[PDB]
Each structure stands twice: as structure tokens, then as C-alpha cells.
Amino acid sequence: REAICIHIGQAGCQVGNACWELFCLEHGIQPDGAMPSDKTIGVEDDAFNTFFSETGAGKHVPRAVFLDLEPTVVDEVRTGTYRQLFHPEQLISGKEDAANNYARGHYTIGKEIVDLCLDRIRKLADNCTGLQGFLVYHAVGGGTGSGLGALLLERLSVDYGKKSKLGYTVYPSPQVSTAVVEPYNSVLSTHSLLEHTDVAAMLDNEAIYDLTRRNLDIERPTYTNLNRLIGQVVSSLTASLRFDGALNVDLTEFQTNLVPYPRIHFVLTSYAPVISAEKAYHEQLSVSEISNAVFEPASMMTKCDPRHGKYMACCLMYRGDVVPKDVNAAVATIKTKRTIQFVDWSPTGFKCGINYQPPTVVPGGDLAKVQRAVCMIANSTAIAEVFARIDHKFDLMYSKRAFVHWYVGEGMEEGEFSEAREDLAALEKDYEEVGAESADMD
Amino acid sequence: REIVCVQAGQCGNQIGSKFWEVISDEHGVDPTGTYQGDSDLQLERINVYFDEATGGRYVPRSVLIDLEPGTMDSVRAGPYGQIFRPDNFIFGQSGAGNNWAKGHYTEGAELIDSVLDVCCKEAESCDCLQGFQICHSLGGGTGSGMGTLLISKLREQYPDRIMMTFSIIPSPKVSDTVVEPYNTTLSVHQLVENSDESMCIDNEALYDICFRTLKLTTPTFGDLNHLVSAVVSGVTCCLRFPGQLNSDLRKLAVNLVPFPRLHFFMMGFAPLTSRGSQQYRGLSVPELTQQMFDAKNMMQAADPRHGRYLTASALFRGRMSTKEVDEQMLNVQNKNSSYFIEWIPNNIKSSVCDIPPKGLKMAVTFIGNNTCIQEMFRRVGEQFTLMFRRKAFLHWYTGEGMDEMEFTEAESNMNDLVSEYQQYQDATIE
Amino acid sequence: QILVGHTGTGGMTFSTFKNGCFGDPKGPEKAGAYRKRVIPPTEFRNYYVRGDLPLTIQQGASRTLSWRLNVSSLDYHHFLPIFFDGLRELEEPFIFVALQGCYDLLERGGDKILPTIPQLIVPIKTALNTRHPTVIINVLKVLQKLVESADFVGQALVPYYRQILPVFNLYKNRNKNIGDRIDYSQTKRQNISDLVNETLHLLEQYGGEDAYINIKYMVPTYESCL
Amino acid sequence: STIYNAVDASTLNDRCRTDLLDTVAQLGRHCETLPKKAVTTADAPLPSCTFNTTVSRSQKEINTYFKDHKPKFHGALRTQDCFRDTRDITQLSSKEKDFVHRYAEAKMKKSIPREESDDVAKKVATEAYTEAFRKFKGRDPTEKELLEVERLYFAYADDGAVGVVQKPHFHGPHMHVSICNRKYVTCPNQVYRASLPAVRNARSRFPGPIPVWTSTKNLHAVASNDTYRPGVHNVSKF
Ligand SMILES: Nc1nc2c(ncn2[C@@H]2O[C@H](COP(=O)(O)OP(=O)(O)OP(=O)(O)O)[C@@H](O)[C@H]2O)c(=O)[nH]1
Ligand SMILES: Nc1nc2c(ncn2[C@@H]2O[C@H](COP(=O)(O)OP(=O)(O)O)[C@@H](O)[C@H]2O)c(=O)[nH]1
Ligand SMILES: [Mg+2]
């Protein structure tokens, strides 16, 4: 039933702002936390419970923490429109950033703030009766997102144990770039995400820019568009928990169906009707068309082409007015395709979900209003190509020790570069080996 | 002579809801629980499925079990849900996750004592108890694991009664879950030891019934569960109404099972025909018999023409001559004689009951014991072998605690079941 | 336990295979009143070890007791309760000293035994609660000596039957039936039940004019002797 | 519950108990001796990351009985033919072989001597044909007229005569209909040994398991989708 969202650093807080805007507007909670008396929701209803708790006077408050080392973004949240919605204890801010150093966040600065984060998260977890995982939003390119995200995932994994941790991560884009030191932070980051996450979803800003230029008709996109798309995706994935449907899918079903081996937990994500209002009225939108859409690489939110690898498992979430015959016909058509290939050890490649609540539309010009949508999470060996470009950039920089004195000065051994690069190399070799056909019976 | 039903998981709860709709309609029970029927023949056997509550009321002798309450709000929301006794709902707080080991070992052993307590409370109230009836899917998680757990406990506690199961099995084409082969194989291993008679259904055959025979434009799981509720309520009809040649579940078992491992049966129900076509064909015993043996109207993907009938049974409802029933069963046995095992001189049992279901002049339900059921199991075993050689998802089951030896035992037992059926499918050279 | 194939009862059902309570059929756990209890430590040990008792163990040819002061001049109000507290001991040399001390103080106590009756009630009631047969026999013999020691002693013990008699009820009907065989336990007075009956008879005899009502009140089976 | 414990707790007598147990034992033995496929096993050179365990999931983990009986009936009808046992269904028919030889003769544009064999059936058939030809016409038949033996079918009669089956019946089950309808698996008019033809699955027919609803010009109709897979049907004559 309940899930708690943890937002770290700049990207994670801004995406959290867009997400909570969406979840408020879909349930109908006023920005003051109340609910107007003219709505037909009913006082008794419970669907909000996944994301809000009431104090008993009927105000709503959300199950989230916002974590940052610089004040500016959280003070922006504090002075914005949702000021009265959040409890002030939930908005935690340090004094100064981790300055794009993973070492500064992990060793020097995050160590001071981390115990406050655990005390607030504990205060949330004590006010639950069916917590079924943590959702984490961060970028691995920056210093505090990498360092405090890793440290916090380690501490959470010791303290909470078996509870599931699902990550949405903004990875360094393959040719769009914002800072020089992105490869070092991403390599050092991937070791912690490897050990301390149950499923990891990969996002690239260059892909969401491509999707908003190509599919939407936006000449001048900004981060709010990308964050609204991410919010729509999370709302689609959690809708299966919150509303009635023909074939429900509990959050444990994603991990059970999608993950074949305990290390093979990095997944590709895509969303079908990313379409503008003018295009949406030019096209019919049947179940099979959006199912065909989620498999085109032009639809993906991570910059990888799945045609260079093999799928192991797919999980398809349908929400809205959909009928099982269309889901079955679509999956059989996908299976028919020749450019879509599954590993021969995974014959039953698909998991389905069907929910009656159509996706909510948030005021503005970034998505049409539609009666049905499908969202996909899939595990594929193609992801090894995504890591290879970071490793090439790391090798280029590390060949001259271009910046290492900063990292060594803030507390890290030089050995950690070689260790992390060898561990990510082993992850590539794992994806090479798992994708090798079973030619042992010859 | 009272039957106790067990309904498990979402599929089981939905099929059960449709079953209790069909039975309450046939016996004229109002959704308030009030008797509103129009003949004494309805009242005189109401005890078979209903218990009597004070001043008029009737309560249905059924136990509802599931591991997450999501389903409970759907069944509670159904048209008859209020009728059910509150104490009969036993539920947990988190789902089975479609994992057999979780459903069998952690929440299974946690809840099972309260389910066994309810089943014993219900059984000891009957003046004479007939067999149990269970509906569940074999491909799921809580259905397979906890259903077979409960079956094992009831077989320990009631070894002299009959144990009958209706079971849903995964289509090779209509997949919904990646780990279906493991759950199916382990559940079939449990059933072949535990069950006395088991009927197996694939959703693909019910879908083909709906599309080809009924020509439904937009079928839903409610139609499939209506077909299932029709056959389940039909098999028991001779238990609870008068007739010229009465029959009983034990007599069906005695005539159907030649050897104790050969207890897996196919089902069919004959008067299915679309509303446009119905003006074109009247009901008659030859027509019912022809549809009854037509594989289009049969609820499994295996076809009888690829196997042989060991035995079959037909139960007729309605006012009809016995001569036509006997001569039809002789004519069908004679005309298709190559498909019947030759060392048994007569393979078909007939039964005749006076009271048809409301609004039909006549109906028949068909139970068949044919070796072509072996084809489904080889297919499931193939997908299992593809998955098992590579340890594709095995770490989930081993992390719960299962030994790989359970998987090798279950595979060996199913393979021996397939072999035993396979020897009887092909006749000797002579 | 795992399910091995080819061993189930599948397809083999026969009527021949046939197999309102608020508590478990085994019944409640026993809490026996005859079980022995722990022995609390006594002040007699401390008084003997420190050396406040005016007596010595004279060895000679056999163990006796010698007193530095004549017995008739001691302060019974102080001394008598400690000796009665020594009846609870079980190991040497405390038991011999306590028993011989109580006997030879009761032998020549005089007219001062009567005022110190209420002080001896607590040692008596705490000795009998131990449910150890040896101290029970010892305290029963001590009571038999005490009742006939001086005048008016028995009439003072009538109000205190409430604190002494509950132990007596356990061992009043426990004699062994050996038929025609002869009993050799009579020589050393090691039987408990006969001692209980004799003590009850003596207590009623010396009680006065209303001891029977109280003894009957506290021992239901008892019937009068006079 | 195990069968042994159930029998021990049952209320049978000793003889029925031991008979039941022995029947179960013989059924198990016959199941064991019946040869079909064996259990599967894992491969030897499995790669890595199939045994390694992530720390998060490490925290997750909890740490002869059967008898043969052929009772013959006196005076039973004949159900086999000497001529029938020689032919094979898979090989092309004798008329087809004659056409193949005539095809070769036409292609080469010259006569080709026929193959010679010492089969008894050919000799018997030629003897009978010559006798009947001499009966009908008072001449011995010419070698060109003896080529009819290849085209026709031959079979014995009940009294030992040799004749020709004019209208052969299908070698599978078929119907001889009279005042009553009857089906015959084998009949004297069949020219090949009895066998059961193979049929397709009932649920892999022209529309798939889930058809798509389309329309004609002005009526509703049905069509197939990817759930329908046509058969291979890779076979050709000659
Ligand atoms: N999609 C999306 N990406 C963002 C957003 N903000 C920053 N990014 C990207 O994330 C990377 C920068 O990471 P930051 O979040 O700024 O790093 P940080 O967590 O603030 O770490 P510090 O600089 O030490 O405070 C760049 O690739 C940015 O393009 C955002 O709001 N949405
Ligand atoms: N006929 C029928 N099949 C169902 C129903 N609900 C689910 N299924 C099928 O059963 C399989 C899912 O198994 P499920 O019932 O969810 O297993 P469970 O979670 O243990 O109860 C899929 O093949 C579904 O299509 C139903 O109401 N009727
Ligand atoms: Mg920052």
C-alpha cells in the first residue's frame, strides 16, 4: 500500500516538485492540504493513502523527504506555492554543496547530514502499516547526488534490511554534457547502485530532450517538461497500487518477473503516448498502436538501442480503458516481430497489468488528454553499450590523472578509481556472459 | 448430502462469485437471502449448498481464502457478497507475489490453521458430508501453493470423502507471467498425489468457445467464469433433484478412473449457441450429444483425436426418453470406435435427471477420460526444461528455501504421468 | 517434509479409511502441594557462629550439652524463639544443638514459659511449611513436649490453631496398608500420620473446654476423643 | 498422508491389505519399466553472476502383472490378404509407375524394355489374366496387352480364385450404408492395410485463438492475426 519517496540533490528535488504537483492534482488535494466540499470523492475513500496521511483534522501531508546540501532549491520550495503542504521538518538543507566531488559528499560533508535524514525517515516509517519500498530520485553526475545517495542507500540497506529500494537515476548523457568530472562520479556511483538497489531504472536527459523535440512540438524545452514526463511515468507505475483493475501488479511482481539473476537488475524504461494535442487528434490510439510504440527505440527514456541486444523479460503496464484481447493480440504481435529477440532461456517473456484509471493530464502543453496509456520496464543486454561510453571517457581522463588530486585530497585512495573501473568492467562481462546462447548441449 | 466449496485467489474468488450466482438463480434465492422460488422441488434440497439461518435466511457453505485483501473488496462488492458469513473470510496482509514457495511456506503455514479450523467447523455441521469442491489456478502463486497445501491437510483429515478440483492452467500463447512453468509443474506434482479426480481448464479454450461458438464481440473474464460455473453446477445436478437414473460423484469416479493415477479429466457442456443462430436449431438429444462430443465445445487445447478415450460420462437434465440416451451412446461408441480403448467393452455411462436448469428444456454436461491430456504436460515440461537448464529465475525459490531436489522430483513424477498416458494412447500391433 | 512420488492416496478413496472443549485433552499442569520447598536461612546459624549462645558441646563419651549458666535464670523471652528457629535446620551440628536446647529448656523452664507463647508461633508455622518430613517429625515431637511442659500452656494455643493446623491436614490419612505384615517403623517413631493423630489428641486433651470446635473447624475429618 | 499409513490405520483384513499393497507395488514397477524421457540436468560450464549474490538480496534471504489374452473364435472371417501385404502406401502406385515409364519412353522418343523381377504376385496375376483373356477371345494375349496387369489391382477370393477389385475403398474408416448406417475400419474392398489418418488441432484452424473483427463492404466479417500460424505443408507429388 504505502511508498515513501526520497529526493536527493537538485534534479531529485525538482523532479519531486513536479511529481507531487501531479499526485496532488490527480487525487484532488488542494495545495493547502485540504479537500473541497463540492468534490464527489467522499470523505471515506482511501486511494490517497499510498501517498498521503491525515492528521485527523483532514489536512493531507505527503510521505516524502527532500535532501540537499545547498539551501537555494529547498528554500525555493519553502517560498513557492506548496509552502503549506509540506511539514517543515521534511525539508532538510545543509550549508554548502559537494562541489562535484563524490569524495566530498561521501566522506566529508554528507557524513554530517546523514543522521538527520535517517531520523526523519524513521519518523515516516513509524507512521506506516504497509510500507512496500523506497523510491529514490537523484543524479549520478553531481557530487552530492552521488556521494550522499550512495551513503544513504548503504545506511538504509543496513537499517531497513529486506524492504525494497527502486531507483530512478539521471546518468551522464553520451554527448550532451554539463560538467567535466561526470565520468568519475558515475563510475564511482555505479558500485553503490550495483550493491544497494533491487531494480535500477536508467534515464538520460538527451533522450527526454529528443522525445520532447521529436514527438512533442516544443522548440524550447526546459527541465520542467522532462520532470513532468518523469512524474507521469511514476504515476503510471504506482497506479497499479491505487485503483481497481482487471490484472493488478504489486510492486513485488516487478522484481519477481523482471530480474532473472540478482546482479541483472538494470532496466530500460519507455512510455508510449508521448504526443502533442495536434498529433493526438490526427491519430487513433488503440492498445496495439501504443504497445507497438513502447518497443521503438525512439520512445525510450534512456539513450540505448535495444536492437543491439536481447530481451530477458518485459513488464507491460496498461492503464485506462483497455480490454484483455487487445493486450494478448499486442503481445502476440510483438513476439512475431523479427527485430525483437528474446534469449532462448526466457520463453514466457512478458508480464501484463491492466488498470481502469486513465492517466491524469496536468495543465499545460506537454501531453494530450488520452483515455489509455501503457508504460514499459524491460531488462536487456543492450545496456552494456551505455556503460562503455562512460568507460571510454574515464580511460581518456584517467590516462593523464586529469583531476585526481581533488578526490585524493578530500579523503579517497587512488586505488578506488581502479577498483570501480574493474567492477564496472565486470558488470559488462556479466552482460556479455548472460547473453551467450546455451551451446553446451552440442 | 452437502458439498463444501473452497475458493482461493482472485481467479478462484471470481469463478466462485459466478458459481454462487448460478446456484442461487437455480434455487431462487434473493440477493437478500430470502427464498422466492416457485416450486417445492427447489426447497427440498436447498440444504445441499445452503445452511439455514434464523427466520428464513440462508448462508452459503463456502470458505474464501486469499493472501492480499485487494480481491476481498471486489468479492464483497459483488451482487451476492452480503450473503457470505463474515467469519468465513480468512486473509493476510501481503500478496503471494506469484511465487509458489512464498505462498506455500511463509503465509501458507501462517494462515492454514485458521482455514483448516473453518473447514472443520463447516464439515462437522453437516449431517452427512459429501466431497469438497475447489476452484483455483495452477499457474498463480497463492492459488497453487496454498490450494495444494489445504488439499493435503484436508486429505489427511478426511481421507474417506471425495476430493475434486477444478483448475486453470496457463495457455502456451496467452501468457501473463514469466514464472508460470515452475508453479504449474510443482502444483501438478502435488495434485497427482493428492487428488481423486481433477479437471483442468486452459483460458485459451474458453476464449475460443466465446469467439467461435458464442460470437461475442468483446468477451470478458465474466463469460469464461460463467462457462465454468455452468459445468460445475451441472455435474452436481443429479445429487439434488429427482430423476429416472440417479448418479453421484462417487459413482462417476468409480466408472471413470481405471487406475488411480489416471484421474485427470476433460469437461464440456453442450447447449452453447449464439443469439443470432438460436432461431435456426431446436434442442434435442441428438443435437446435445453431437455438440457434447464436438471438440469445438470442449474446454482444453488437446484434441481427443490425438488420444483415446478410456471412459466417458454424460449427465442429462430434462424430460426425455431413456431409449434415445442409450441408443445415442451406443451409436457414438460404434461410429468412433477407433478412439475408444478396446479392452473395455463399454466406455460411456449415462444418467438422466428430470429437472433442467431454468429456461432450458434440456442440458448435458460431459466428463471424459482421454490420454490427450498428456500433450499439455509435455509442453509445460518443455518450457520448464528451457528455463531450468539455465537457472533462469531459480534464485527466488532457493532464496525462500526450496531444494532443487523438489524440482527434480516434480519433473520426474510428471514425466512418469506422461509416460503412463502415452503407453495407453497407442494401440498394440497384435 | 517433502512429498515423494508414487506414495500418495490419489484416486484411492474408500469408506474403510475412516480416522465443544475449552481446553487441551491433556489437562492442566500439576502444582503438587506435596512438593518440597526451599529452606530460608535462619538466625540460629548467625547466633551460634557469632557466639551469643551460652552453651557448649561436651564430647566425653557421647554428645551432650553443658551450660555455663543455670537454665532457670536465663531470659526465655529472648532465647526461646531462636532455638525454635533452629528446628528448621537440616545439617549438623545445628540440628542436634537446636533439638537438645529446646528439650532441656522446656524440661525446666518453670512458670515463665506461658508469657512467651506468642513469640514461638512464627518459628512453628515457618518450620512446618517447608514440607520436609524430618523437620516435620522434629517439630511434632517438640509440640508434644511443649503442650505438657507446664500449666495453662494448652489453653493459650487455642486461638493459634489457625496458623499451625493447615499442615496437619496433609498427613493425617497417609498410613500404609500392609495387611497382615508387621510394621517396624514404630520403634523409632518415624511414621508421620500416627504422630499427627497423637498430637491432635493431646492438643484437644489439654486445650480446655472449646478446643474441639476449632480443631474440627481446621481438620474436617477429625472427630472428638473426649 | 501416505498410502502405507492409511492402510495400517484402515479396517481391512490382512489378505485384502496385502493384495492392495502388492497391486500398488506392481503398478509402480510397471511404471518404472516403461521407457520414456529422463529428467533434465544443468549444464557444466555455467558463466559467472549465476552464483554471486548482491548484498541487498543477501539481507533479503532468510538463509508379469498384466496378462495377454487373445481368445480366438471358431469360424472367424478372413481379415488379411496376401496381395495386400506386399503393397506400401508411401511408395507411388503401380499406375503411377507405369506413367513414369511411359513418360521416360516419350522423353527418349524410343521404346524402353521393362524391368524384370521374380515376384510371385506378378506371376499369379499374369497367369489369371492370360486364362481369362483366352476364355473371352480364342487367342493368347500379346505382350503389349499384358501391360494391363500393372494398372489393375488383384486379390484372392474366399474359395481361392483370383480377381480384380474394381472399386477400392479408402484404407481409413469409412461408411457402408444400408437400411442401417455402419462404419467399417477394415473391409474386403480395401487395397492397402488399415491405418488412421492424421488430423489437425481443432484450435489451430483458419482463425486464430483470438480473431480480429473486421467488415466486408457492407457486412460484418472476421479475419486472422499473428495468433494464427499456417501449416508448413511442404510436400510435392513425384
Ligand atoms: N532531468 C533533469 N536533470 C537535471 C536537473 N537538474 C540537473 N540535472 C542534470 O543532472 C546533472 C547535474 O547534477 P546536479 O543535480 O546538479 O548535481 P548535484 O546533486 O546538485 O550535486 P552538487 O553540484 O554537488 O550540489 C546534469 O547532467 C544536469 O543536466 C533536473 O531538474 N531535471
Ligand atoms: N478464467 C479466469 N482466469 C483468470 C481469472 N483471473 C485470472 N485468471 C488467469 O489466471 C492467471 C493468473 O493467475 P492468478 O489467478 O492471478 O494466480 P493467483 O495470484 O495465485 O491467484 C492468468 O492466466 C490469468 O489470465 C478469472 O477470473 N477467470
Ligand atoms: Mg547542487
Coordinates of N, CA and C in Angstrom, one line a residue, chain B residues 5 17 21 23 27 85 96 120 122 124 130 158 182 214 224 255 262 285 288 298 300 308 332 344 378-379 416 426:
Chain B
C5 N -17.4 -26.0 -0.5 CA -16.6 -25.4 -1.6 C -15.4 -24.6 -0.9
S17 N -17.8 -16.5 -7.3 CA -18.9 -15.5 -7.4 C -19.9 -15.8 -8.5
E21 N -23.8 -17.2 -8.0 CA -24.8 -16.6 -8.8 C -25.7 -17.6 -9.5
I23 N -26.0 -20.9 -8.9 CA -26.7 -21.8 -8.0 C -27.9 -21.0 -7.3
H27 N -31.8 -22.1 -7.6 CA -32.7 -22.3 -6.4 C -33.5 -21.1 -6.0
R85 N -21.0 -15.5 5.1 CA -20.7 -15.4 6.5 C -19.4 -14.7 6.8
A96 N 1.0 -13.1 -2.6 CA 1.9 -14.2 -2.8 C 3.1 -13.9 -3.8
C120 N -13.1 -27.5 9.1 CA -13.6 -28.4 10.1 C -14.9 -28.0 10.7
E122 N -17.1 -26.2 9.4 CA -18.2 -26.4 8.3 C -18.5 -27.8 8.1
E124 N -18.1 -30.5 10.2 CA -18.8 -31.2 11.3 C -20.2 -30.8 11.5
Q130 N -20.6 -34.8 1.8 CA -20.1 -35.3 0.5 C -18.8 -34.6 0.2
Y158 N -9.7 -35.9 6.1 CA -10.9 -36.5 5.6 C -10.6 -37.5 4.5
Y182 N 7.3 -23.2 -13.5 CA 7.6 -23.7 -12.2 C 6.4 -23.9 -11.3
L214 N -20.0 -18.6 -29.4 CA -20.9 -17.6 -28.9 C -20.8 -16.3 -29.7
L224 N -16.0 -16.3 -19.3 CA -15.3 -17.6 -19.0 C -15.7 -18.2 -17.7
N255 N -16.8 -45.2 -12.1 CA -16.8 -45.5 -13.5 C -15.8 -44.9 -14.4
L262 N -4.7 -42.3 -13.2 CA -5.3 -41.8 -14.4 C -6.6 -40.9 -14.1
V285 N -31.9 -34.4 -28.1 CA -30.9 -35.3 -27.5 C -29.8 -35.6 -28.5
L288 N -27.7 -32.3 -28.7 CA -26.9 -32.2 -27.5 C -25.7 -33.2 -27.5
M298 N -15.3 -28.2 -26.3 CA -14.5 -28.8 -25.2 C -13.5 -27.8 -24.7
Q300 N -10.4 -27.8 -23.4 CA -8.9 -27.9 -23.3 C -8.3 -27.8 -24.7
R308 N -6.9 -41.4 -27.0 CA -8.0 -42.4 -27.0 C -8.8 -42.2 -25.7
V332 N -22.7 -43.4 -30.9 CA -21.4 -42.6 -30.8 C -20.2 -43.6 -30.5
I344 N -11.9 -52.4 -23.0 CA -13.1 -52.1 -22.1 C -14.3 -52.2 -23.0
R378 N 3.5 -32.3 -21.6 CA 4.8 -32.3 -22.3 C 5.2 -30.8 -22.6
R379 N 4.3 -30.0 -23.1 CA 4.5 -28.6 -23.4 C 4.9 -27.8 -22.2
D416 N 6.7 -39.4 -15.5 CA 6.1 -40.7 -15.4 C 4.6 -40.7 -15.7
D426 N -1.3 -45.3 -27.7 CA -1.1 -46.1 -28.9 C -1.4 -47.5 -28.7

